[PDB]
């Protein structure tokens, strides 16, 4: 969490929490309900967003979607979509937390190794994340979309 990151820095410094750091935690408390509301909206529209983003991703990377790609056949495409769904759930968890560190633990560590082991294309995964960002902008308020877009941008960097 944001508190976890700030406390980690303070513990390394071996100092009680600074006034500004405490203020940051207080801001998290103030905006916790709004963050939870955005996360609840994401969970509510999770299935529809997954479907729409999947269509956009297949359009962007037809070879992977087609036979002779990583998502060759309905079963392979379904497994790919399930992995993308796990990404989306992790993104929702990170958005609720307010810190990208939980999402990094879930998916970012060894992401290149996992993609190489599967054989699938990392750039296509990133494009799917971008499609999810557009859908989230449609389904969120402008202030909510900006924060969700920032977490999704960290996800895009993780895909790279």
């Amino acid at each position: 969490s944001v508190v976890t990151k700030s406390i980690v820095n303070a513990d390394a410094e071996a100092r009680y929490l600074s006034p500004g750091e405490l203020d940051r935690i207080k801001n998290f408390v103030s905006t916790g309900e709004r963050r939870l509301r955005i996360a609840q909206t994401l969970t509510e529209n999770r299935e529809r967003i997954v479907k729409q983003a999947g269509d956009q991703l297949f359009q962007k990377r037809p070879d992977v979607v087609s036979p002779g790609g990583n998502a060759y056949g309905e079963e392979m495409t379904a497994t790919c979509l399930r992995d993308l769904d796990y990404y989306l759930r992790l993104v929702t968890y990170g958005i609720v937390a307010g810190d990208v560190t939980p999402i990094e633990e879930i998916g970012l560590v060894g992401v290149r190794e996992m993609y190489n082991s599967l054989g699938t294309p990392i750039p296509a995964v990133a494009e799917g994340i971008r499609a999810m960002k557009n859908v989230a902008c449609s389904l969120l308020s402008a202030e909510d979309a900006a924060e969700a877009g920032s977490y999704f941008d960290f996800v895009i960097g993780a895909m790279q």
């Binding site: 406390i7 009680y16 939870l36 996360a39 796990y86």
Partner: protein, 161 residues
């Protein structure tokens, strides 16, 4: 380390499912308590020296530990005792801000008993001192902050083993 929000996230990850409404209610309760916890942590930092002084005086002032051969009868041992007590207070304070004692247990309670056994320090006497510090800290912070601080101090007492 771990925090309250991180613990909820860990439970959701183990489930492999999106956050439940009841789990979200638990998170909302943490958000509600955060304001009082943060103000209490700021108060603890401001009066940290006073808390240490009062607790040390109640625990071991004018005692055999201070008297020659009492293991706190050297100036170095006296300073080291204060250092260990201050570290206990500070780490527990950070854990109180988090709302989760896992960080305190992992960071401070790992191997502490073995190290204290090698040192020869009385863990039980330290536990009595920590309980006295919990009483003083509860008095200075207030009732609401004292209850959480007491729970964290009880976790420290369990780690004393």
């Amino acid at each position: 380390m771990q925090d309250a929000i991180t613990a909820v996230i860990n439970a959701s990850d183990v489930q492999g499912k999106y956050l439940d409404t009841a789990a979200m209610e638990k998170l909302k309760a943490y958000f509600a308590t955060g304001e009082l916890r943060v103000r209490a942590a700021s108060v603890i930092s401001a009066n940290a020296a006073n808390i240490v002084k009062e607790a040390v005086a109640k625990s071991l002032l004018y005692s055999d530990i201070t008297r020659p051969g009492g293991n706190m009868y050297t100036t170095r041992r006296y300073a080291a005792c204060i250092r260990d007590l201050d570290y206990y207070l500070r780490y527990a304070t950070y854990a109180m801000l988090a709302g989760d004692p896992s960080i305190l247990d992992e960071r401070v309670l790992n191997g502490l008993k073995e190290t204290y056994n090698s040192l020869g320090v009385p863990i039980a006497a330290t536990v009595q001192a920590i309980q006295a510090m919990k009483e003083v800290t509860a008095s200075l912070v207030g009732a609401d902050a004292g209850k959480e601080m007491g729970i964290y101090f009880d976790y420290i007492c369990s780690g004393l083993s």
